[PDB]
Amino acid sequence: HFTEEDKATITSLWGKVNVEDAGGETLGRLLVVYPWTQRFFDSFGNLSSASAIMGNPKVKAHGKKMLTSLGDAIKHLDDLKGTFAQLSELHCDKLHVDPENFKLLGNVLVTVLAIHFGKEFTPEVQASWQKMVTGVASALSSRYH
Amino acid sequence: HFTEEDKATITSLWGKVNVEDAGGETLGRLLVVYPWTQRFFDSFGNLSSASAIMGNPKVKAHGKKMLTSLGDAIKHLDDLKGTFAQLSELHCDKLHVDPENFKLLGNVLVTVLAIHFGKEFTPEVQASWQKMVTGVASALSSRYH
Amino acid sequence: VLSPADKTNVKAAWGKVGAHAGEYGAEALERMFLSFPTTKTYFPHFDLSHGSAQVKGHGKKVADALTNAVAHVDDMPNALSALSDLHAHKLRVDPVNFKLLSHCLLVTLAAHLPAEFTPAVHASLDKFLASVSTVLTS
Amino acid sequence: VLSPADKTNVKAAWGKVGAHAGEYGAEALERMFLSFPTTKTYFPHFDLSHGSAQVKGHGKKVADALTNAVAHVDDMPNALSALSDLHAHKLRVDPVNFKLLSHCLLVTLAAHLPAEFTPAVHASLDKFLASVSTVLTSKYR
Numbered sequence: 121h122f123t124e125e126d127k128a129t130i131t132s133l134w135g136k137v138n139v140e141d142a143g144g145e146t147l148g149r150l151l152v153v154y155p156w157t158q159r160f161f162d163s164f165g166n167l168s169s170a171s172a173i174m175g176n177p178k179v180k181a182h183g184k185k186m187l188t189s190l191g192d193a194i195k196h197l198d199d200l201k202g203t204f205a206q207l208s209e210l211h212c213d214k215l216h217v218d219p220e221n222f223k224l225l226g227n228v229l230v231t232v233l234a235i236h237f238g239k240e241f242t243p244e245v246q247a248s249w250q251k252m253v254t255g256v257a258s259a260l261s262s263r264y265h
Numbered sequence: 266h267f268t269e270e271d272k273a274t275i276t277s278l279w280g281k282v283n284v285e286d287a288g289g290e291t292l293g294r295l296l297v298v299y300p301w302t303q304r305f306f307d308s309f310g311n312l313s314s315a316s317a318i319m320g321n322p323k324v325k326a327h328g329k330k331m332l333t334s335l336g337d338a339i340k341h342l343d344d345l346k347g348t349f350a351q352l353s354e355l356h357c358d359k360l361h362v363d364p365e366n367f368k369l370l371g372n373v374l375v376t377v378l379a380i381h382f383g384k385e386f387t388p389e390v391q392a393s394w395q396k397m398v399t400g401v402a403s404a405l406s407s408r409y410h
Numbered sequence: 411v412l413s414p415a416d417k418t419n420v421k422a423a424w425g426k427v428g429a430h431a432g433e434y435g436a437e438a439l440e441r442m443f444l445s446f447p448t449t450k451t452y453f454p455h456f457d458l459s460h461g462s463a464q465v466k467g468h469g470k471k472v473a474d475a476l477t478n479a480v481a482h483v484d485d486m487p488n489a490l491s492a493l494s495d496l497h498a499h500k501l502r503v504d505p506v507n508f509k510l511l512s513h514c515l516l517v518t519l520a521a522h523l524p525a526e527f528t529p530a531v532h533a534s535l536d537k538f539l540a541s542v543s544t545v546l547t548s
Numbered sequence: 549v550l551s552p553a554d555k556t557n558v559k560a561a562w563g564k565v566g567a568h569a570g571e572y573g574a575e576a577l578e579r580m581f582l583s584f585p586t587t588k589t590y591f592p593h594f595d596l597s598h599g600s601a602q603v604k605g606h607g608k609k610v611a612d613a614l615t616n617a618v619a620h621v622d623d624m625p626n627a628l629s630a631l632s633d634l635h636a637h638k639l640r641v642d643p644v645n646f647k648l649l650s651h652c653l654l655v656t657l658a659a660h661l662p663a664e665f666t667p668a669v670h671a672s673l674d675k676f677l678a679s680v681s682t683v684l685t686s687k688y689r
């Protein structure tokens with residue numbers, strides 16, 4: 121249920137987003153704010169504090185990879201489930217990530233968009249992005265069911 | 266994505282359930298165990314205690330109606346989303362029931378099934394019903410997206 | 411438990427809010443009402459429309475309690491001990507919806523203080539809002 | 549965070565568990581592993597099949613901790629302190645998982661003690677398990 125305005129708002133803001141910077145910032149903040157999530161990223165090296173996590177090149181690279189696959193979905197908002205079908209099998213079967221973590225990461229992303237857009241990130245614009253976040257988390261949980 | 270085995274287990278166990286009694290027990294326990302849900306049923310009268318709640322004639326009637334629509338959905342486990350479409354609009358658009366509450370209710374139903382079936386409700390049998398809970402909650406939360 | 415840098419960050423961040431704490435409290439509520447309509451059912455006797463004076467007034471109360479809590483990070487369960495009985499026992503608020511308001515407050519702060527909303531401060535603010543939440547639930 | 553009726557319900561219900569505390573803890577784990585497979589990753593080198601001696605051994609430790617918590621319902625932060633550090637800092641258990649284990653324990657109790665598991669006792673056991681969970685995640689917080 122992406123409304124016409126939802127689609128329009130989400131497409132506009134994503135155009136203005138620097139994916140590499142939002143991605144690294146997003147994954148990094150997930151790791152700092154929600155420490156248990158570091159269990160899935162043991163091989164990335166030192167994740168002991170805000171300073172270590174945010175300057176970590178592997179965290180930067182990987183968040184950029186996260187965020188770009190999200191950008192794929194924005195081109196095709198009506199079939200989020202399809203787009204994320206293989207990443208679902210990945211995060212579920214291989215990585216064993218609990219689905220609640222998908223909502224946590226999406227909420228961190230919303231706060232990173234807020235930082236970037238400031239007063240442009242109105243309560244209405246945020247409501248559209250919360251829908252996107254919910255939709256994405258849903259699509260990633262799909263191979264859990 | 267239920268497995269066939271899950272569908273068998275859900276269908277077989279549901280056939281031995283008295284929908285009336287499990288329905289009232291389920292809604293009663295939800296209201297007692299999670300008192301914030303009582304806010305959605307302002308019209309129901311005396312919910313001041315476990316005793317009053319479990320004995321409240323409106324609570325029983327309502328629990329019956331709720332679990333009856335679950336039984337009707339059990340006939341088409343491949344299409345829960347389509348079945349609960351109208352109910353999803355009702356709970357979300359009209360009542361503004363938090364989707365997390367949908368899981369709570371399913372979890373309470375699971376315990377009520379455990380009370381009724383005893384050791385027939387094996388860990389394996391429970392796993393199938395948890396999928397059912399997840400599937401119902403998701404079909405009902407659909408109109409949040 | 412909150413580290414010394416956590417208390418320092420929370421107090422720093424709340425100082426950067428300046429005279430807009432009431433305003434930011436109201437915006438967080440309004441954000442929560444748009445993104446999560448289920449929270450509106452806790453406010454049956456409120457006008458919740460955009461620009462509402464009741465929302466504006468309630469935001470100042472929330473911001474005041476938060477300001478009060480920041481002042482007493484060391485013995486928070488006590489400073490909010492009064493509020494704890496009202497939300498948990500009387501209003502009966504889902505311990506889950508405290509996360510929604512916490513998210514919306516952080517989004518509001520991010521949107522208004524981008525320079526101040528560093529990762530460290532974000533983690534400190536999140537632990538702070540979680541501790542507040544647990545106090546209002548436990 | 550409990551009440552006199554609560555404390556009484558918990559103690560009565562937990563005392564009906566009796567000689568089977570360990571067994572119920574192992575069954576609760578097994579229910580969690582099967583219903584919520586992601587929780588298996590916390591036990592990489594355990595035998596997680598049914599009747600596993602490692603799970604039996606472990607269900608016994610959980611139940612002991614619960615038994616101790618019941619014996620100190622009023623000072624739970626003190627009683628479960630080392631477990632708190634263990635689950636948060638060392639094992640880094642996702643908070644979500646505590647809710648899942650709690651549900652599985654309630655199911656086990658429901659399945660074994662149908663008559664004891666009244667709505668009021670069910671409410672008490674839930675608040676008790678929520679409290680235990682809160683303490684176990686306090687290092688996050």
Ligand code: HEM
Nearest residue numbers: 157160161185186189190207211215217221222225226256
């Ligand atoms: C919006 C939510 C998410 C999106 C779009 C997403 C997307 C991705 C993508 C595109 C990859 C690359 C995989 C490949 O190229 O083969 C990946 C890998 C990975 N994801 Fe995510 N993910 C999400 C949520 C999460 C969360 C919340 C966690 C952990 C709590 C997580 C854990 C991982 C890990 C550990 C890897 C790589 C494992 C390795 O280094 O080999 N994901 N994800």
Ligand code: HEM
Nearest residue numbers: 302305306330331334335352356360362366367370401405
């Ligand atoms: C498995 C999940 C659920 C199912 C299958 C279900 C089913 C139903 C059904 C069939 C109705 C009847 C409406 C009508 O007759 O027109 C109803 C109404 C209602 N439901 Fe649910 N429900 C579920 C979960 C919940 C939950 C968790 C709540 C939490 C508060 C809730 C709150 C309500 C309320 C307040 C009504 C009002 C009906 C009246 O006042 O007559 N429902 N539901």
Ligand code: HEM
Nearest residue numbers: 449452453471472475476493497501503507508511542543
């Ligand atoms: C950091 C979190 C929160 C803080 C600091 C907070 C603070 C407050 C304050 C200061 C009041 C006014 C008390 C008075 O002066 O009478 C209040 C009342 C109230 N709050 Fe909250 N609150 C928080 C979270 C929430 C959440 C998440 C909800 C619902 C989703 C909520 C719902 C309510 C309701 C329904 C009232 C009573 C409204 C009335 O009768 O006028 N609160 N809270």
Ligand code: HEM
Nearest residue numbers: 587590591609610613614631634639641645646649650680
């Ligand atoms: C819900 C209440 C829980 C209680 C009372 C509890 C209690 C315990 C106890 C007593 C131990 C043994 C600690 C020792 O060595 O002294 C332990 C270890 C452990 N627990 Fe828990 N626990 C709980 C929840 C969980 C959950 C939800 C998970 C994960 C889903 C979990 C995963 C583990 C792991 C991986 C170990 C170490 C096992 C090993 O490798 O030896 N626990 N817990």
